């Protein structure tokens with residue numbers, strides 16, 4: 001209600017500061033970092049890359065990130081705790097399920113998944129005592145039967161705990177509409193929900209409609225714009241053809257409609273990435289050498305020079321995340 | 332060489348004794364036991380249950396089991412080590428991949444997969460220093476492109492280390508002939524390979540032809556039967572409705588054909604099972620309350636009753652697994 005759980009323990013809302021609400025230390029798979037750390041060089045190398053990355057973002061003004069890696073994205077909260085401490089950057093951990101659940105998850109009922117998400121929020125992740133502060137869910141297309149189960153379990157776990165829900169969808173399919181329908185059917189307030197990867201599209205009427213319903217809008221893939229990589233047979237499905245400035249102007253466009261309170265902005269960056277083709281990290285790092293500093297270093301100045309006042313930018317990057325992450329059951 | 336890796340370190344083959352070559356402590360998914368131990372009651376409850384079960388198998392004569400759980404079956408080698416030591420039963424751990432690889436595995440090349448299998452055999456599993464003594468692979472009747480990468484990497488790891496390969500098949504679909512072809516294209520000797528779940532079929536022509544090529548034949552799900560449970564679709568789908576005696580008669584059948592040296596026998600049992608419907612473990616434990624002791628307590632006397640000589644049964648339960656597990660270049 002006033003405290004947010006991080007991988008170093010609870011913090012007050014005022015301690016969160018400039019918060020990146022959709023990031024990853026490492027995009028992987030359950031068990032993978034511990035079974036095959038040499039895939040990333042070593043555990044130590046990955047840790048060190050992350051601490052440098054977070055220290056870079058911290059010098060650009062960032063104070064907290066939300067690592068939205070779930071169980072099936074190979075979240076290792078011990079790694080998150082280690083990196084957080086060494087970089088002095090708060091990290092909020094996530095529960096939920098992304099798009100690669102193993103059989104032991106895919107065969108579970110909504111009631112069972114609800115208990116799993118609740119365990120991670122109320123008791124702790126694994127045997128670490130670290131509690132999740134957000135629920136991450138993902139869907140494709142019009143929402144598969146299992147994904148619907150995940151979304152309902154997420155809503156139930158949110159309703160019991162006050163922690164918010166953040167989603168990945170296919171914005172080019174206006175996938176947020178179907179997510180919103182399911183959440184509302186469960187009695188979840190839209191102000192507990194961020195509809196994300198929303199900058200994957202240029203359909204502003206869609207985004208405005210969601211914000212008008214009280215949904216947070218996650219404009220979280222701004223540096224995923226590539227430009228120059230059409231020779232690559234995997235850098236158009238994970239990156240982009242439009243510029244990052246195009247994506248960033250969506251931020252301005254929602255502000256102007258009166259919805260600055262509904263906007264969350266992030267990089268959707270990571271320091272290791274095993275759930276994709278080999279060497280993808282060298283590709284991504286060359287396209288965005290700023291990493292998690294891209295928002296404070298490129299996007300914030302770009303908006304400032306398009307006329308957005310300081311107080312609005314602080315509203316989006318400090319106030320909005322604090323309101324979102326503070327556990328609440330009140331609408 | 333004459334020693335094999337177990338979760339308590341290297342043993343001599345003479346120490347393996349009566350060996351069950353296809354078992355599990357817990358059938359799960361990577362990361363799952365550690366993230367959600369309450370699914371099994373608790374980690375402690377699961378360990379206890381396994382130790383009670385292994386101790387009963389030991390009482391019945393079992394000395395070694397091969398836990399063919401892979402990374403993606405949720406193998407927790409620390410759990411295996413804990414229950415091995417407490418039951419005082421040797422457990423051989425596996426590398427390889429089963430039928431649920433996560434993206435971080437299924438996007439890998441055959442060279443990469445070879446490196447991973449070799450790490451688990453030559454360096455150790457995770458950070459435990461425990462090394463795998465067998466490579467487990469699984470395919471779906473018609474082998475997928477990714478499963479074919481997995482079989483080629485398994486062959487390559489086997490050729491580099493001498494450790495054997497054991498497979499999960501759709502035996503009703505003759506899965507072993509496609510596997511065998513890939514393995515031989517890589518130069519793998521059939522004597523390094525067990526074509527498992529082969530008791531899932533009564534096609535003796537298929538079994539005997541692989542046995543004639545020098546493959547080991549895994550008749551390794553003998554107690555799996557949903558007879559009596561036809562009103563349970565999930566248990567019927569999993570266990571089949573062939574009787575355990577039907578499965579067991581294939582052991583006699585292959586002996587009768589002259590292939591006693593190629594038979595490996597097991598229960599394919601487990602003490603927790605999250606990668607199927609909820610409470611499946613209670614259903615399995617009512618079908619087979621003997622658990623992993625089913626082979627020595629029920630199958631062996633059944634075979635002795637049908638006239639199989641004791642020396643032949645000892646050769647199948649002791650000598651054949653020893654020959655199979657012993658690393659052989």
Ligand SMILES: C[As](C)(=O)[O-]
Pocket residue numbers: 024027073168268
């Ligand atoms: C790990 As991702 C590419 O869904 O943000």
Ligand SMILES: C[As](C)(=O)[O-]
Pocket residue numbers: 358404499599
């Ligand atoms: C975990 As199984 C049913 O493939 O032996």
Ligand SMILES: [Zn+2]
Pocket residue numbers: 138168169197
């Ligand atoms: Zn995503």
Ligand SMILES: [Zn+2]
Pocket residue numbers: 022023024068268
């Ligand atoms: Zn992401």
Ligand SMILES: [Zn+2]
Pocket residue numbers: 499500528
């Ligand atoms: Zn199997």
Ligand SMILES: [Zn+2]
Pocket residue numbers: 353354355399599
């Ligand atoms: Zn098995």
